[PDB]
Amino acid sequence: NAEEQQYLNLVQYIINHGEDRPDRTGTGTLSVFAPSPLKFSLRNKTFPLLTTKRVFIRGVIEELLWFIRGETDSLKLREKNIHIWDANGSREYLDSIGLTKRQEGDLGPIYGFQWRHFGAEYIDCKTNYIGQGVDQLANIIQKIRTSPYDRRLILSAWNPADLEKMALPPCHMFCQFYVHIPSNNHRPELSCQLYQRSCDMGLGVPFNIASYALLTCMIAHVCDLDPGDFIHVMGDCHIYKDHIEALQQQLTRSPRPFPTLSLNRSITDIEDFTLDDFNIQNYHPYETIKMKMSI
Amino acid sequence: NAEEQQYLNLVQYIINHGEDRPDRTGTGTLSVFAPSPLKFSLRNKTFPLLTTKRVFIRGVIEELLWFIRGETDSLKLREKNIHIWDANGSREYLDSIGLTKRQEGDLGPIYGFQWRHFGAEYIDCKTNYIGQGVDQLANIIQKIRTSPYDRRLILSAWNPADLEKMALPPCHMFCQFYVHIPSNNHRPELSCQLYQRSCDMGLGVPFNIASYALLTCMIAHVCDLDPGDFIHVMGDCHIYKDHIEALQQQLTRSPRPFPTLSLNRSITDIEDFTLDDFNIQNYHPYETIKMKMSI
Ligand SMILES: Cc1nc2ccc3ccc(CNc4ccc5c(c4)CN([C@@H](CCC(=O)O)C(=O)O)C5=O)cc3c2c(=O)[nH]1
Ligand SMILES: Cc1nc2ccc3ccc(CNc4ccc5c(c4)CN([C@@H](CCC(=O)O)C(=O)O)C5=O)cc3c2c(=O)[nH]1
Ligand SMILES: *c1cc(=O)[nH]c(=O)n1[C@H]1C[C@H](O)[C@@H](COP(=O)(O)O)O1
Ligand SMILES: O=c1ccn([C@H]2C[C@H](O)[C@@H](COP(=O)(O)O)O2)c(=O)[nH]1
């Protein structure tokens, strides 16, 4: 409600004050740099899925599960009717950035590969990288359980050495987790601060918010913690000019309270979650608003 | 002033509401996660060098220049009578973290090495790394002069694959630059958003604020831009206990206006700056306050 209003207020702010700038995708964008971070409480099982707009949660979970497996083949998502990566993985796109010998769908060493094998030599999206590079995610879980107050709980996909091999350099670049000391005598809280260098407010941001709120909830669950807060920090925060009209109608809408999230099945290893382990109760959004990706 | 007040209000807030938590150094700390970012305007040549406590700006400049040369030998700083890195480079500390074969002073592939040679194989602090790895800094300067509105102007020292080799993992992890469109008809401004995963509010933060304001001014200067804003985002923001004493009073001192900075001699290349090229004027801080480091 008020939390969702933050997002809506940022959208209105960019519409009314964003700088008009030239985009690589030819389309126009209104943009603001370093706006105040968005904050979402994950307490009481609350889950930050926007209500003023239908948010396809299934694809969010599938993408996260795919990242966790260290996968980089977009066909794995396409096989499940998730097409967000089809454009950046297309033969045409790949050739436009000089990746003429990359099979279609092989996005390169993006999120998943960096999260699980940072530093490993990338070959293709069919190779088994077990044991290569550093498994940041496993390391984070292990540290949380061993020295939860550690100040190095970083999960990062930003690898300068691999950028030229990626179909798209990471937008959600890195996040930091923090375990809070027990309030009163409750279960410790796990918070997450995400830094996103480039944020497509109309299309991407709602999914990214959900994505990290889920990840935080998953790692909290597997570590016997309760989820605390999700903090979304943004660099170039923008709106594609062909989304304005639609956002302005979304802006006339009133936020309903967020749904809740229950992690069922009692999963105990981050790698064990599956689509059906996620229980989102009481999600009642307004209709869906069509917002086309600008590739 | 009001800008310096942000810092002061944060110090006091941590003193009063910060979580008490065990530290690796053994000392205790008061800490808060993801407090509101501090923002500093670099317009009108304003340089955010704290006045409520004399900041060793010569040490700030020399460390920055050392970072830019891609240096990792703390002795280079020691020769100039700058000692902040001596402890982390000592035989004792080095061995304490398992670097028993590392020569004293050889910090490993930290900041400067990552900035100019990300991904290169680190050997020691006396090896010539020219041409190895990714020169993020040169790439940023070239992108600004080529396609300023690029959303990928990132400078990062966070390299999971090299963390174990570092005497200390990066505190100021990465920053993102943003070139604003011209306002009215004045020269475009360059802004910088820094993400610091762990901030020693008492000792480090004032130096880091100064350090990144300087870098921003330097890149802008060589790219024919004017400086815009410096935004400091923080993860685990803390105060060391053995520092609270010397900080509660600093909170009694009223902030004077910040000095100004002029970069002269017409340096036109980022690797050409030297100490005398920095002209900090009207810097008049209160007495210097002794604050011990926690190895
Ligand atoms: C310009 C631009 N390009 C992108 C390229 C790749 C992306 C990959 C992931 C995400 C964020 N994550 C998800 C995860 C799942 C879905 C969606 C986004 C969008 N989505 C659409 C349909 C996808 C389609 O447009 O092809 C829907 O309305 O539900 C999902 O199923 C955003 C982008 C952007 C993006 O936001 N903007
Ligand atoms: C616990 C802790 N450890 C650190 C380890 C390495 C660091 C490297 C750089 C900076 C930030 N940059 C500078 C750059 C120059 C100076 C100082 C800090 C501190 N300083 C001291 C003298 C050096 C000393 O402490 O030995 C002074 O009070 O003038 C300077 O000359 C902070 C740390 C911290 C830090 O702030 N805290
Ligand atoms: C690290 C280096 C710097 O430039 N600035 C800082 O404030 N610090 C501080 C943070 C922390 O107190 C200590 C590093 O400890 P850790 O790696 O976070 O565990 O130095
Ligand atoms: O999870 C994601 C991935 C991408 N983007 C958007 C941001 C940009 O509009 C475009 C990436 O383009 P560059 O910033 O790299 O140009 O995709 C997001 O918002 N979220």
- What one-letter code names the amino acid at B232? H
Quote the minimal CA–CA distance from A284 to chain B in Å: 30
In terms of C-beta density within 10 A (0-12 exposed, 13-18 middle, 19 or more buried), how is residue A180 classed? buried
Q: How far is the CA of A148 from the centre of ligand 1 (A)?
A: 33
Closest Cα to atom 23, ligand 1: which residue? A84
Helix H or strand E segment including A197 = strand A189-200
Distance from C-alpha of A57 to C-alpha of A68, rounded to nearest angstrom: 17
CB-CB contact of B30 with B19 (8 Å): yes
Quote the minimal CA–CA distance from B18 to chain A in Å: 11
CB distance B160–A198 less than 8 Å? Answer: no
Q: In a 3-state reduction of DSSP, which class is residue A13?
A: helix
Which residues have CB under 8 Å from B45's CB, separation 6+?
Answer: B260, B261, B262
Buried b / exposed e over B130-166, threshold 16 CB at 10 Å, is eebbbbbbebbbebbeeebbbbbbbbbbbbbbbbebb
Q: Is A152 annotated as a binding residue?
A: yes
Distance from C-alpha of B86 to C-alpha of B293, rounded to nearest angstrom: 11
Distance from C-alpha of A125 to C-alpha of A49, rounded to nearest angstrom: 31
* B88 CB within 6 A, ligand 2: yes
Distance from C-alpha of B175 to C-alpha of B209, rounded to nearest angstrom: 12
Which residues have CB under 8 Å from B111's CB, separation 6+?
Answer: B67, B157, B170, B172
Distance from C-alpha of B122 to C-alpha of B108, rounded to nearest angstrom: 7
CA dist list (Å): B95 to B87, B98, B100, B292, B295? 12, 5, 5, 22, 13
Closest Cα to atom 12, ligand 3: which residue? B200
Q: Range of B84's domain?
A: 1-295
Q: Is B152 annotated as a binding residue?
A: yes
Chain A residue set in contact with B, beta carbons under 8 Å? 19-24, 33-34, 36-37, 118-119, 133-134, 136, 147, 149-152, 154, 156, 158-161, 163, 169, 173-174, 176, 178, 180-181, 191, 193, 195, 197-198, 229, 231, 233, 235-236
| Beta strands B278-281 and A154-156, pairing class | unpaired
Distance from C-alpha of B141 to C-alpha of B148, rounded to nearest angstrom: 9
CB distance B34–A154 less than 8 Å? Answer: no
A30 to chain B: which residues are within 8 Å by CB?
none
Sign of the C-alpha dihedral, residues B269, B270, B273, B278? positive
Read off the tokens for B171. 């505190």
Instruction: Kindly report the backbone phi and psi dihedral angles of residue A40, in degrees, each rounded to the nearest multiple of 5, phi listed first.
Output: -130, 125
In terms of C-beta density within 10 A (0-12 exposed, 13-18 middle, 19 or more buried), how is residue B4 classed? buried
Distance from C-alpha of A41 to C-alpha of A261, rounded to nearest angstrom: 12
| Closest approach atom of ligand 1 to CA A204 | 36
Buried b / exposed e over B268-292, threshold 16 CB at 10 Å, is eebeebeeebbebeebebbeebebe
Read off the tokens for A60. 């969010």
Closest Cα to atom 16, ligand 4: which residue? B151
Distance from C-alpha of A279 to C-alpha of A263, rounded to nearest angstrom: 6
Resolution (angstroms) equals 1.9
In terms of C-beta density within 10 A (0-12 exposed, 13-18 middle, 19 or more buried), how is residue B200 classed? buried
Place of tokens 């100039």: B80
Closest to A52 (Cα-Cα) out of A293, A291, A284: A284
Distance from C-alpha of B63 to C-alpha of A103, rounded to nearest angstrom: 45
Domain count, chain B: 1
* B14 CB within 6 A, ligand 2: no
Distance from C-alpha of B146 to C-alpha of B141, rounded to nearest angstrom: 9
Distance from C-alpha of B71 to C-alpha of A136, rounded to nearest angstrom: 27
CA dist list (Å): B229 to A38, A226, A292, B40, B187? 20, 37, 33, 6, 14
Task: Name residue B260's beta-bridge partners.
Answer: B46, B281
Q: In a 3-state reduction of DSSP, which class is residue A39?
A: strand
What are the start-end ranges of the E strands in A116-183?
A: 154-156, 172-179
Distance from C-alpha of A135 to C-alpha of A115, rounded to nearest angstrom: 6
* B64, B84, B110, B242, best to mutate for ligand 2 pocket (most atoms within 8 Å of CB): B84
Residue A279 DSSP label = E
Read off the tokens for B39. 């923002």
CB distance A181–B20 less than 8 Å? Answer: yes
Q: How far is C-alpha A31 from the geometric centre of its chain's CA atoms? A: 20
Q: In a 3-state reduction of DSSP, which class is residue A110?
A: coil
Distance from C-alpha of B213 to C-alpha of B229, rounded to nearest angstrom: 8
Distance from C-alpha of B270 to C-alpha of B277, rounded to nearest angstrom: 12
Vertex A197 angle, CA A163 and B210, to 5°: 105
Sign of the C-alpha dihedral, residues A117, A118, A120, A126? positive
CB distance A19–B160 less than 8 Å? Answer: no
- What one-letter code names the amino acid at A215? L
Q: Is B198 annotated as a binding residue?
A: yes
A37 to chain B: which residues are within 8 Å by CB?
34, 36-37, 233
Distance from C-alpha of B140 to C-alpha of B88, rounded to nearest angstrom: 30
Distance from C-alpha of A141 to C-alpha of B134, rounded to nearest angstrom: 30
Question: What CATH number does the domain containing B270 carry?
Answer: 3.30.572.10
Distance from C-alpha of A34 to C-alpha of B35, rounded to nearest angstrom: 15
* A14 CB within 6 A, ligand 4: no
Distance from C-alpha of B219 to C-alpha of B177, rounded to nearest angstrom: 10
Quote the minimal CA–CA distance from A115 to chain B in Å: 10
| Residue A29 CB neighbour total at 10 angstroms | 27
The torsion defined by the Cα of A169, A170, A171 and A175, in degrees rounded to 10, comes to -150
* B168 CB within 6 A, ligand 3: yes
CB distance A173–B154 less than 8 Å? Answer: yes
* B53 CB within 6 A, ligand 3: no
* A97, A111, A168, A203, best to mutate for ligand 4 pocket (most atoms within 8 Å of CB): A168
Distance from C-alpha of B295 to C-alpha of A77, rounded to nearest angstrom: 47
* A86, A168, A171, best to mutate for ligand 4 pocket (most atoms within 8 Å of CB): A171
Print the SS3 string covering chain B: CHHHHHHHHHHHHHHHHCEEEECCCCCEEEEEECCCCEEEECHHHECCCCCCCCCCHHHHHHHHHHHHCCCCEHHHHHCCCCCCCHHHHCHHHHHHCCCCCCCCCECCCCHHHHHHHECCCCCCCCCCCCCCCECHHHHHHHHHHHCCCCCCCEEECCCCCCHHHCCCCCCEEEEEEEECCCCCCCCCEEEEEEEEEEEECCCHHHHHHHHHHHHHHHHHHHCCCEEEEEEEEEEEEEEEHHHHHHHHCHHHCCCCCCCEEEECCCCCCHHHCCHHHEEEECCCCCCCCCCCCCC
CA dist list (Å): A81 to A51, A78, A280, A285? 23, 5, 20, 22
- What one-letter code names the amino acid at A70? G
Residue A134 DSSP label = B
Place of tokens 């002069």: B145
B191 to chain A: which residues are within 8 Å by CB?
33-34
Q: How far is the CA of A229 from the centre of ligand 4 (A)?
A: 24
